[PDB]
Design a protein around this ligand. Structure first.
Ligand SMILES: CC(C)(C)NC(=O)[C@@H]1CN(Cc2cccnc2)CCN1C[C@@H](O)C[C@@H](Cc1ccccc1)C(=O)N[C@H]1c2ccccc2C[C@H]1O
Lengths: 99, 99
């Protein structure tokens, strides 16, 4: 589908058997979620954004359904103010910017 | 044109007679640059992102040529790790997300 930017580009996602809304965020290299229970091991990771750095855990090979599309990739979990889907996943569902 | 997301969606922009590289950021409501000298009055403003909040200057009605398209809008200038073009300006040039 085509999505204009006159509002935040939100999409509903299923991940870990849980439902959530993420913002399609071409400015984010990675994907991060506020609070969701993910199974298995993880590696610490400290990401930098506007306003500072945050400590988060990294989960790889995580199945995630974005707007009805099925993809798998690394998903971060940490103290973010908004759930974001990054280019690491937006590439998998073939998302592009147009103008 | 059409821009895939396998790399950061950077575009060249001219603002205040200066040249800058900016990130097409669908996840950002506003536009902000690290260090540019814009003329006229501004209004203090505090924005929040992942990792924290930062105090910035808010200049309105600022001409900005994005990827060869001329638009005018609110541009923020503050301590950001990367220049970002937000939806407030993306809508002006008619950018959409596609998949
Ligand atoms: C208006 C303003 C510009 C302050 N908005 C944001 O920063 C929003 C904030 N929300 C949240 C919010 C906060 C307060 C109120 N409402 C909403 C979360 C999403 N961001 C947009 C991000 O796309 C910004 C980029 C900026 C950046 C690029 C390169 C280097 C440093 C900073 C960003 O945060 N990028 C990083 C990033 C982000 C997520 C996951 C991984 C990574 C890595 C990296 O690409």
């Amino acid at each position: 589908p085509q999505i204009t930017l006159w509002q935040r580009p939100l999409v509903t996602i299923k991940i870990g058997g849980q439902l959530r809304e993420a913002l399609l965020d071409t400015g984010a290299d990675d994907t991060i979620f506020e609070e969701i229970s993910l199974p298995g091991r993880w590696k610490p990771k400290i990401i930098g954004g506007i306003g500072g750095f945050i400590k988060v855990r990294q989960y790889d090979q995580i199945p995630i359904e974005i707007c009805g599309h099925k993809v798998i990739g690394t998903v971060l979990v940490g103290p973010t103010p908004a759930n974001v889907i990054g280019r690491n996943l937006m590439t998998q569902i073939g998302c592009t910017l147009n103008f």
